Amino acid sequence: AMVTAKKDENFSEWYTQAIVRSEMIEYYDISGCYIMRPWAFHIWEKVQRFFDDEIKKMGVENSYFPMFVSRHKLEKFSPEVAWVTHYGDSPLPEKIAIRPTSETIMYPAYAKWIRSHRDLPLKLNQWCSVVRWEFKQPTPFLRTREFLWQEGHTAHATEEEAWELVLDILELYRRWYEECLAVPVIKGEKSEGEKFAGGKKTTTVEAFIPENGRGIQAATSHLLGTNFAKMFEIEFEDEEGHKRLVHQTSWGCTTRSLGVMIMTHGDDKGLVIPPRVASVQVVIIPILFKDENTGEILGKCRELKTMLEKADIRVRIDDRSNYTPGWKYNHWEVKGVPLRLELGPKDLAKGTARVVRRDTGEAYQISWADLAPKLLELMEGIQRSLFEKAKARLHEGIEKISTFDEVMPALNRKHLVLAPWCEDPESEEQIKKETQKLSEIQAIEAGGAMKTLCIPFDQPPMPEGTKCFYTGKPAKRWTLWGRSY
Amino acid sequence: AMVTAKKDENFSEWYTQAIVRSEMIEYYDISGCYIMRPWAFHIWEKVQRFFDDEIKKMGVENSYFPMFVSRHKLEKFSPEVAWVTHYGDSPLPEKIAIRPTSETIMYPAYAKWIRSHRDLPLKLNQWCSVVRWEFKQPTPFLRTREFLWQEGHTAHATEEEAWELVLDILELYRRWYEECLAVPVIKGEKSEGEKFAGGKKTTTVEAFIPENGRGIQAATSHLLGTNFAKMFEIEFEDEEGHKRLVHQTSWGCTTRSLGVMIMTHGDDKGLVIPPRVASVQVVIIPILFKDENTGEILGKCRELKTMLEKADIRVRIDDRSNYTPGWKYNHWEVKGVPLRLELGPKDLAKGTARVVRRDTGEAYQISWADLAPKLLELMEGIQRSLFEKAKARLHEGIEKISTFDEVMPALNRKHLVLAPWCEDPESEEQIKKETQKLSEIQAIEAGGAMKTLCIPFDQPPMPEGTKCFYTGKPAKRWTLWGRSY
């Protein structure tokens, strides 16, 4: 089974083929829900371990809160909430909702647990699934009605400490995407219209999908401030004895990250998995001629596997006799294994192995003694090259503009725009409406809204007197806009 | 905050105090659901890592299937199923159920995935929560409306291979309880009346709670046979080309395990956590006289912590100046930390530390150079002693009987009974009914049913011609009975 849709032509069909034929997902009779098979789930387990280890260093501890929230507590978005109303065919006295997020589940407990400044900071995380029942068309990994995530929630005695935590977690999400998944992301702050309404400031990491020109939010970290503390009466006492509101954060990231990884590195042959998260980094394929000492070849493959595992390289031998090497090459290319090692009688006679890298197809002849250090070096080169090429595509996908006239041409090249902006929220909604209308007109001519993605932390120079690209009022900051998921 | 209820007098109040005052659980406004705070959740993470590592050696892979099942697929117990019927206030075309278990979610996929004998065995596991909405009174950890678990599901070409896997998983559950949690359990097969009706044979590990005399199922491993394969049309082709049904297993274990651990080792002071799963194995408490070189004492505590962590000992220093040592001693005793290390000026002058073990209160004076190996030895002694004392209580809690006349006296001593049994299912239900009725009579005289717990793998000798303790017919095997959760 090969991927036959080309990534640059029918991107949606390519994506479906890549994730189905690699055995990452399976469909399900309830629309908008997908089965995560082991090939994808192993990658989730790897980024989960990374993130857990990092937040444990910060003093965050895992926990588990109930999946249900009482009507009263939830209603302290609404068409997205799935409601449990009966046990069997008996009606519940009050209906209960499945968590779309757990603020209203956790914060009553926080109010009970926090009494003194000595109780702070309080730092909790949980890994679980949440449910958001939208009637729109789903996309595997990217927009689904049930998804796995982690959500962290912290409380602090001061706004500055909470803010520092918000930025520390955002840096962890940058590392999740860029270090683990080799996906470049842009740190920024959401516009007033796009931020979490329950909070003070929402920070984000944003990724870019060149094939459809869309930005996609990769993860989020909110400075909640004291808003939820007032609503849930979460207060603490200073050492003088006065009661003060806590300052809160919340943050999350989902299996969307896997989809972004898939879209970023995949090619016409299928998946390409970054070595740092590949469950199989090296697949060993013995050549099995009928007229050969097959036992010797297999024994050497086993020895090489042991030698590589001593360097913590994750190895699988595909010694199935009933498939050709060509079949196996394709099979593990579709699944995205970053390195394949081939060993036949001539290699054994020379004391070498043939190694082929998945991203470029370049082949190497490596001595057995050099194999472990050379493969470690090659995997680091593959990881870095995947990231650097994606980063070049990201920066080639952003157009710096000064006037609204440049917007629609840039959108039609499937690019984002970086533009000086007045940051008035009313203007963002005017811009969404107008770019949607222009996109519809174009659609009819062909036989869509542009919104803010983020106000980037990394601000280009802003010349004095620069005007907003849409209102002509004084610009405040450079803002990243585009079509979006 | 101290535990004030005595374990041997008001066991239910003791249990509640132990798990609340140690900060393991928090209550919730939806009855039958509880919050798992980090002190308990860390123990879950530890047994999860153990079990994951062990099943990965068996070729089992983790996955994630949806939490929802369509009405049609579920109804292929019923008053326990929670039904989602509305998104917002809009009605679903067909209601969907929250998983009480995932056979009906997973096996349609299995039928799609399995085509050839080369596809077998198929071995999958998932970690998730499930929901069983009983209107009866809940018990934290032991019987709750939502609980965390793992469920494994495998498919094999032959019954013998599946059966071998059933027993391998049951041995893993024995290790989960006995090796990790120091809880002794009895392997056995469930009676025909008590087994999973969807399967062929159900094996179990059973634990015993002496304070209320109750047996409790600890984990389960089912030989499903071909029953579900017929129902879901899961078939494979041999190399000759004929289609055959797969032979399946399923198995699971829940956070009930934590409650069993708590009940087994706890004492009047609170929790006692086995060192192998304790998140803090050693708490270091500096003595902080006002008239002392506090910096030197704290610096030595830090050095000792580093030295112990190099032996992979999990250490916390409680250097809070605003609590007395006596307060701290109680605080970490309630939470069950197995070792406390005390260090003050006299200890520093002697080059030793004072170490107190939680299970017995015995104190030791240990040189700094001996600290790591001696504490490793002490933790192994604590783990083994917790297990051996629990095992002695288990065997003292079982009475071997020959006649039904011995049942009610043994139940009144809060014991289980091991009795020769004819294994006729009708007789088990007669025994349940009669022992319930006798228990009610006794209750009224004081101002309850006994069922089979398991047919143990370890069978005592059965003399020729032994009769069933209840029917007088020829006995088949020794069966373990008792009151139960």
Ligand SMILES: Cc1cc(N2CC[C@@](C#N)(C3(C)CC3)C2=O)cc(C(=O)NCc2cc(F)cc(-c3cnn(C)c3)c2)n1
């Ligand atoms: C996996 C996932 C991930 C995310 N998000 C949101 C932000 C975030 C990031 N960063 C989080 C949660 C981490 C902070 C993330 O990952 C959102 C959704 C989702 O909104 N699901 C419902 C749904 C189902 C569905 F069938 C269709 C749609 C749908 C179709 N068109 N439109 C416009 C919607 C939506 N799902």
Ligand SMILES: Cc1cc(N2CC[C@@](C#N)(C3(C)CC3)C2=O)cc(C(=O)NCc2cc(F)cc(-c3cnn(C)c3)c2)n1
């Ligand atoms: C945590 C957990 C664990 C378990 N089990 C079952 C077997 C098993 C083992 N081994 C598994 C699942 C691993 C195979 C286990 O752990 C069962 C329940 C439960 O049945 N919950 C519903 C409920 C809620 C409730 F408020 C009250 C009751 C209730 C009150 N009186 N009676 C008679 C029932 C029941 N809960």
Ligand SMILES: O=C(C[C@H]1NCCC[C@@H]1O)Cn1cnc2ccccc2c1=O
């Ligand atoms: O979930 C959040 C805020 C943060 N919660 C913690 C983890 C990170 C996350 O962005 C925003 N949101 C999103 N979607 C909904 C749908 C229905 C009901 C509530 C919500 C709702 O509140």
Ligand SMILES: O=C(C[C@H]1NCCC[C@@H]1O)Cn1cnc2ccccc2c1=O
């Ligand atoms: O869940 C099982 C069988 C096994 N499933 C896999 C993990 C181990 C587990 O014992 C039995 N059961 C128990 N309780 C229910 C309540 C409502 C609906 C179905 C059920 C139901 O089927």
Ligand SMILES: [Cl-]
């Ligand atoms: Cl939001």
Ligand SMILES: [Cl-]
């Ligand atoms: Cl969100």
Ligand SMILES: [Cl-]
């Ligand atoms: Cl059952």
Ligand SMILES: [Cl-]
């Ligand atoms: Cl069950």
